């Protein structure tokens, strides 16, 4: 039996995996956010713990955790948790979506010209590093008391084991990690008046970082079970879904269209919408791009044409007349809908076809920006709610020229990846290949050479068209 | 009683008018176009006759044409009908929307510089003169035979009366006419290597040019009634509505958008998209400009939106979110418009889109009229007709945008055919004036521009123009 904990933003989810990778139980505990000022997004670390501790006790109450062999955690990335020399929480946690330190972002980058090379990323406000630069400037007294800076998931580890550890995936998200070397970057820390002494110890996601404090062990009805490093939500998310080896990639369609891809070694493209990170497994890295916004984007056009169901415009999209207008929908990305109008003089199911293809071109280019970094998948697992239309799925295949394997499941979340990482650490024998399955294949879409060849020139809209036009 | 004929491009329509000037009957017969190579728009002069004939009989089966005293005719402009000495058709008619002669246009204007001055227009392939210069180049054998060149309705006339004639408003659209002098231009003809002998005889549209040949009068069940010169569909249509004196103008929001204005003398604004032609009346000229059809845009938008009737559109437009950012609908005219929807967000639904259309079309029409006015035209109020003008909300939005008073009148359902019949009445009753003979359509409603709403639209028009000119390139 294994435990998997995920410290999300809305709450914490804790799961119980049976000896063969199946989810026997689950518990979720809501978590609120605190917005003291515009752009501020904070959480009380003691609320993360209380939620976790309730979830666990709620889980073991259902079924005894007296057989759990290992435990893993995953959490919201980038959150800064400042603790004093006695492990006490100085100020609330500044979350991934907190955008108060934009200016400290410029400062840091001016302080280390080679910042984007090191972290492989552009310095953003949600990132951990610039927040501490902010605390130093706005709350000097609290900054002076800093002994340790922990990410959300890791603060939780501290409460369970008394240890100070993190995993490469989550660590890289701090902008203090030298992503390539998978180790703290001194230049980075120094630029923030911080030192390794204030960072937790680094582990690969599947490595054991400590055991459960006896107290905790007793409070939850389980032994002093070992606790693995785990990973940040994205990485632990892919782990639980089997997205592990090089050139493996997935798209989720979405309340975000997110493209996540495992690379061979460290790749990066800062000046783009591409984010680079370490994976939650040894010698593995990944890249990812957010995209649409093919749920929003598509409901909008369904109401726009008097339709109310997205299923409807997909159907409508289908009877478009092979009148080729062709249409030409440009989407923009807040988010908001830079929403480029079009070209036309025909119908609603003809416009339904335009919208669906506009999104499709936007996605194709998103994945191509990733691929041009050094990734070339043989196939692309496709999962999510916005991916239930076989028709739209097949369109994305013909547009991008990527084999799209549709798969069901993928609803558990990072928690499943946290329990999987725990299974790995508990079964040094079995091979990863044995402990990391994928979601059950639901369909496989191969690009229709006919439509594919006709589309590549069509995508010559999201060529000069999308570019001549901003001005937004 | 009176007959009018309209040789359209797709139909022909014949109406019967009573001594009062009201419609008693009407009939239509369809035609089709040939579209052989691309840019080629051809038609069979014979298909016109069969269609016209069928209709007249059909009109007759409805009412008796025994009391008809005079007959008028109007037709599609600029079409080019080539006949040999035996009065035979050398080749299909190159319609107004044919474009095989773009080269020949430039060549003519190069051979005749004062050309825009003489004709008062910008050479376009739809015009007659460049088409013949084309035939001379590509089909020189067919050119060697040209004995006469006739406009669509005039070919129709020859078949009805054995007469070779045309009216000034239709002859003006050939570019062989010195529009200011109401007479052919030898300069323009010599350039196309043509001669007056190959041109028909010119008349004011209200002048009789012949009479129905006995067997024609016979088959159609009417006497050998006189036939007037008539006018091009535009000029004719204008006579029907009553557009007869300087600074009288009308905006047609039908399937065919046109802004027509009777000028004070011959006004020449060639470099513009404003056209200057002779009116179908004595001593009368005009300017005209092609516009959008409102009532094709309003239909298209009502469906794009799922709103299924144009009154729902206009209602929706009125329910738009006063807080949602502006959406710009840029209508590009080639009822073929191409259109752009700039600035669409999560906040923008069918109601907001409804309103973007009405404004875009309205802004487009206000600018169209403005171009013609800056030309010299000074209408106090403008007559508004067409199906696109049925909605009152929208008559007012349009008044408010344009800043022009709009007198909405009923009965432009009839078309140029009413004009034809009108010109016929003028010839038949030579003692009567035009005041009595060309009334204006009944006043349905007068829209005075709202000062506040006007001032409000003003910066929005300016932004529509910038945005329009900015995408113009991405257009054609």
Curated annotation (Swiss-Prot), chain A:
Keywords: Allosteric enzyme, ATP-binding, Carbohydrate metabolism, Kinase, Nucleotide-binding, Transferase, Xylose metabolism
Catalysed reactions, as listed in the record: D-xylulose + ATP = D-xylulose 5-phosphate + ADP + H(+); 1-deoxy-D-xylulose + ATP = 1-deoxy-D-xylulose 5-phosphate + ADP + H(+)
Glycoprotein among keywords: no
GO biological process terms, semicolon-separated: D-xylose catabolic process; xylulose catabolic process
Function according to Swiss-Prot or TrEMBL: Catalyzes the phosphorylation of D-xylulose to D-xylulose 5-phosphate. Also catalyzes the phosphorylation of 1-deoxy-D-xylulose to 1-deoxy-D-xylulose 5-phosphate, with lower efficiency. Can also use D-ribulose, xylitol and D-arabitol, but D-xylulose is preferred over the other substrates. Has a weak substrate-independent Mg-ATP-hydrolyzing activity.
Family designation: Belongs to the FGGY kinase family.
Protein name according to UniProt: Xylulose kinase
Designated gene of the protein: xylB
Swiss-Prot record, chain B:
InterPro entries: ATPase_NBD, Carb_kinase_FGGY, Carb_kinase_FGGY_CS, FGGY_C, FGGY_Carb_Kinase, FGGY_N, Xylulokinase
EC number assigned by the record: 2.7.1.17, 2.7.1.-
Active site, per annotation: 233 (proton acceptor)
Pfam families: FGGY_C, FGGY_N
BP GO terms, sorted: D-xylose catabolic process; xylulose catabolic process
PROSITE patterns in UniProt: FGGY_KINASES_1, FGGY_KINASES_2
GO molecular function: 1-deoxy-D-xylulose kinase activity; ATP binding; D-xylulokinase activity; protein homodimerization activity
Outcome of mutating residue 6 to A: Loss of activity
Site (Important for activity): 6
Regulation: Sugar binding is accompanied by a dramatic hinge-bending movement that enhances interactions with Mg-ATP.
Functional description taken from the UniProt entry: Catalyzes the phosphorylation of D-xylulose to D-xylulose 5-phosphate. Also catalyzes the phosphorylation of 1-deoxy-D-xylulose to 1-deoxy-D-xylulose 5-phosphate, with lower efficiency. Can also use D-ribulose, xylitol and D-arabitol, but D-xylulose is preferred over the other substrates. Has a weak substrate-independent Mg-ATP-hydrolyzing activity.
Subunit structure: Homodimer.
Family of this protein: Belongs to the FGGY kinase family.
Official protein name in the record: Xylulose kinase
Gene label: xylB
